[PDB]
Design a protein around this nucleic acid. Sequence first.
RNA 1: CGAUAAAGAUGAGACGCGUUUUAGAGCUAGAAAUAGCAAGUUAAAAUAAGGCUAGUCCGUUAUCAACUUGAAAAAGUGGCACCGAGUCGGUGCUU
DNA 2: TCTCATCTTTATGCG
DNA 3: GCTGGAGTACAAACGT
DNA 4: ACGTTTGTACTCCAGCG
Length: 1337
Amino acid sequence: DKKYSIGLDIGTNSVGWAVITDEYKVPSKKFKVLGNTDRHSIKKNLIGALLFDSGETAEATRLKRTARRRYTRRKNRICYLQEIFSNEMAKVDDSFFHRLEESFLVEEDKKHERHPIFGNIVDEVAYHEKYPTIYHLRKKLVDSTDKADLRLIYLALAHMIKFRGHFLIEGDLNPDNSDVDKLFIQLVQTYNQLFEENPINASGVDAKAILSARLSKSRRLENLIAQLPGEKKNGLFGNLIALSLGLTPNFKSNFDLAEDAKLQLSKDTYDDDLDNLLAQIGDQYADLFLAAKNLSDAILLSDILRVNTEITKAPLSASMIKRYDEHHQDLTLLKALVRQQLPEKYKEIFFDQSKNGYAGYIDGGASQEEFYKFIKPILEKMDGTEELLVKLNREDLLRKQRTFDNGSIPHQIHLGELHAILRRQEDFYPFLKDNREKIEKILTFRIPYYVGPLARGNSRFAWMTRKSEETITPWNFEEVVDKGASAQSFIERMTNFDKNLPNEKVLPKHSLLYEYFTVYNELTKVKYVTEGMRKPAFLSGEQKKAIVDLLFKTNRKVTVKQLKEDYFKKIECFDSVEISGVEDRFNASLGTYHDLLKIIKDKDFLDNEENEDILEDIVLTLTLFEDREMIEERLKTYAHLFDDKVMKQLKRRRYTGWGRLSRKLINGIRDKQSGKTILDFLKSDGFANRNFMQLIHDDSLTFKEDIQKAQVSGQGDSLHEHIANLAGSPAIKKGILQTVKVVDELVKVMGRHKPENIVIEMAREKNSRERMKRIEEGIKELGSQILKEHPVENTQLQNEKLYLYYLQNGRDMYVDQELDINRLSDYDVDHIVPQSFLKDDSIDNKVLTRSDKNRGKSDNVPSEEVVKKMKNYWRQLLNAKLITQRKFDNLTKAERGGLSELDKAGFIKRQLVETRQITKHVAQILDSRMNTKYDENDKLIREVKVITLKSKLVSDFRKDFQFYKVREINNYHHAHDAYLNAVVGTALIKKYPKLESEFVYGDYKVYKATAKYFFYSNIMNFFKTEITIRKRPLIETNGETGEIVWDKGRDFATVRKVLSMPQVNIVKKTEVQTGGFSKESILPKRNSDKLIARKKDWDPKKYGGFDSPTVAYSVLVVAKVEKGKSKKLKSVKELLGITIMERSSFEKNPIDFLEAKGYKEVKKDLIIKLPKYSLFELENGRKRMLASAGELQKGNELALPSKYVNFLYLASHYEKLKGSPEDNEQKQLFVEQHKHYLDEIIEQISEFSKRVILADANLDKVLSAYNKHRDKPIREQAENIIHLFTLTNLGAPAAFKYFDTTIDRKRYTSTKEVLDATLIHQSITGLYETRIDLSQL
RNA sequence: CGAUAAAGAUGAGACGCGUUUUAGAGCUAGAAAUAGCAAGUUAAAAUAAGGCUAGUCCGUUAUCAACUUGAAAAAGUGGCACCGAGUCGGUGCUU
DNA sequence: TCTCATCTTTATGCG
DNA sequence: GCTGGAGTACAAACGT
DNA sequence: ACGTTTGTACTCCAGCG
């Protein structure tokens, strides 16, 4: 019955907890120990931390699942092609598909001849000599007209089907036009034939170099416009050019039609939008857009084809043949020149596969970039190569055909080649003539993304209904799958359900019922006064209907002047009224009513009371689907109510948005007595005209009881399900769930007593590829040449200053000067908004500068002169995706107002109050689980108080008060942070019961800039004895009520004793592994038993396979094995690692699995399931953790005394120095006077290593390296000792560095010692324990 | 209040590689060892073993100390106080 | 590497 | 980058 | 006694865009 408190520190991979009393003391209790050990009771402290691995997102699993689906569908495509070809294939060569199936087999396992295509050596050699690549065969079958073998036709068609390319370009692509300059001249000719007043002159323009350039699309348009004499990118020619490159232009202002008419060629809606545009202006511009389409094809095809198209119908195959021919000729020339000029480095280039030469390029694993990097110095140190260097700098030297540039190849090229093959060979075999559309559909059947996995009720990711039960093929997909219902389910399964009625789906944001609801809701707020009335009054329902009918149906946006004039003056004959309750402009509007009035061109139809469900279905259709024909098939039902042009304008109309209020709420639920819905109470309420937010909270109305009945239904969810519903990363969700479980166990431990204080706090918590992509895109967008000035590497970007040099254009900001790369030390990183106001160390806030004083003022946002001068550079960098919109606003805030003292006071308060939403959610969960009972009038009795703090409080309490934290010593700092959070939170709510609404989650009512500035600058000043000098008393009082909120005489020793306290329950969370079976690398054949078979009948010694499996859990077994030739039963005890592949078979029957492994007469009751991170105690406190069935981890925590921790923090200069010169001078003097503490810390590390960290050679190397560097300054020695604490850390072993000397990790390949040790089962807090003595087994 | 921008989460539809085994008869001089020379660019198949519900589906996310009750979700199980502190110990009281 | 959809949260100015 | 698996070279406890 | 397996040191590798 003792009052206490709980402090929490929640992180992504660590949760800390502590129980404190009223006097800020951590209790200790005797906890009973279960098991067969001699120990029965252990004294443990109520402070500790839980450590776990970080939670992972489902993105990797989703990508793997999508890859599996794609592989299955590609195999099905090949199966469909084989099914088409099989009837004639059996007549030509019946074993052909069988030979192709068994190609991945050795000669001993093949049931047929080893030659896949022809089945004999001579024909295979002749085929490979005639067609060295498949593209030679594809070009031959497109071009030649003689009869070919059916095998060759199938091989070409299957190569096109298997590798069909992308579907990014929708429509038709014609490869017959490939000259950029010719169609650019044609476009200019058409423009001059149409426009005669201002013709475009484009003679002497290098069209091919400009339009097919390697920089960005927008910069390509800008470079064409800059060359163009007297033309504008917003002009008609500029719009046509931008449309040709594919950047979407706006044709509104060019033609003055008052609709956008945006045209994008890659979209299938372009044809209908161009039909609309032809209806707008006429058909005289159609040839102009046809020329623009042809020039767009010329741009998008000249990058990939790079070959003549007038001599063949297969430009891509001709391009690949050109690549093969150039590779052959330059290979011959390079071999000749190497043999002539450098004959010693011929074996390295052409025979050594380990090097990055041609042998490494072809046989080895070297890529194209690595081969160029190897061979370019060879060509430079040689004087007979110019064309090879020219091709190498053009990335066209010794090219392969299956490269990484094939990702930009459209499916139209492969489709055209397939169609050409089908057209050439249909007259000879009639079955391709009868099945031409079948094979073309097989190539061009992409499942719509709104129709998910074609499932039959056994999938969690499927939204798809079948019109008939039938096997879906590419040819009957349209007839079997109901596509409209599938797309409706696609949108509706991720749309929200409104909170008041959890089983009801929300309306679209642009619904007529929703806008009627909002308009009437705002109209209830309107109140009027005019002469003769003794009191303000509200508009009756007949009046409000009349106001909607005039003002909201006419205006689109009503203002109070309009309603006053027309309704009060024109109708009600009140010449002068004062209007209240609304702004000058109204917020609510009949937006979709006005859009439908514009489209339908009828007004009575939309006004009608009983047609409104039709228009709700109309706007539902316009919100759900984005594909044109889906929208078409839905308005075929309602088309006969409208005109065909009207229905087309409906077809092109869009609404993008969903509300958060359902339909049955607005007009479905009604009161028991009145029978009027909430919309009707907004329409007419007698005199009162009361509105929504109270109507869901009104005691007299039955809306509140129906809403609470709806919320109660379903009983909410479980704790895990409520946790997964939340926002944020899954790792923080794991942290919160472990926090809640820790709180529940802590409540159970104390004797089911709940504390009237819970203080929580939350941490704020690959990239390099994003960095390279961002810098490349920036230099392409703005035309920057910084990469061409000096190119750099990828691992070099990890340093902040080098990245910040390359991110900006070689300059520093606020001044127009270039700066140089070599001067690393003399340049510094600056923050745009100063560090004193806000904390933001990201690149979004940081700037690298050479002189920070040119910012105008030292502590403010950059001066308005700097804004007015650098604004053009800021705008052009914003358009180049190198700064953010937030960065733009932060730079341009000076012209927009700068920093007000209100804004500075906000940037002072923001470090103290936690406004993060996830912390509010955690506080709500803990408040709901702790405070449960209700009292009279149904109010929640807040027996447990949940306080939320930010890390600034605890960090300042550590920094000001010599409670320093060093993270590299041990994980005790997590529990220490939790304890300090508890102390600070309870002290703050004891001293200031007025800041409860700011610091406590709850329903409270307690709440200019300068007083706020001093308040939130000085909230922690009651902890320190001297202010600034002000001498506050040693014993602090709450004020207006007498309690001891802080006692500087004795509480300080209590906090220091809790921080200097050796036993802290550090628990590493025991987990069973979830993940993939093995490493994803397929390694070649070798005679090892550690290789895993890729299929059942693929022996790894003959086919290769996977190597390194992941152990799910280790299993302890006591059994007898066969030993010697006599096969004698020898008793053994062992750990066997059950992998994820083996886990299902093991849990199905452990005895059969162990008998298959070799162990005999195993005991089912003696099998102990040991997951990863299980704890074993051996002797002298040496505790080991289980990493696998062959490797152990170190689990032991070095309880280094707090004086050494403080000395290490002050000596190493953590976070540089931020304090008064007297204070840091005194700290430096203290560090100087205690240099023997280094030797004492080395003694502590050596003794703790010799007791539990059995690494003799590593410790000897550590001591030798320490003795080498005793003359170094104390700061460097302290930093290197902080590095030295990696040896004694709890967890997996890792390498660390002492100055220049490095020490590799001491690892274990044996787990034999823990088999005769005490196995410890630890609860989540670690207080409740179970010890199993494994030596008794 | 809508709005703008960015980030994150979730789900679907697609590409291009990469790896692996096989196919693409390597020649000459030697007893072999090996040396010299020729050639190299492509294709098939697999791309988590696999499973049953047999779908052009699913299989790498989240949850997970021990014991007991369990169909599971989960529920239940473990005195207190004081003096101390090198991973927790001792003393007293009581069930 | 690309296309599409939904949701939430934070930062940016109005009132 | 992390840290567990795998290979190699070799000396040392250890069982037939 | 001699084999032999085990304990130790050291190196290398990890599917991507």
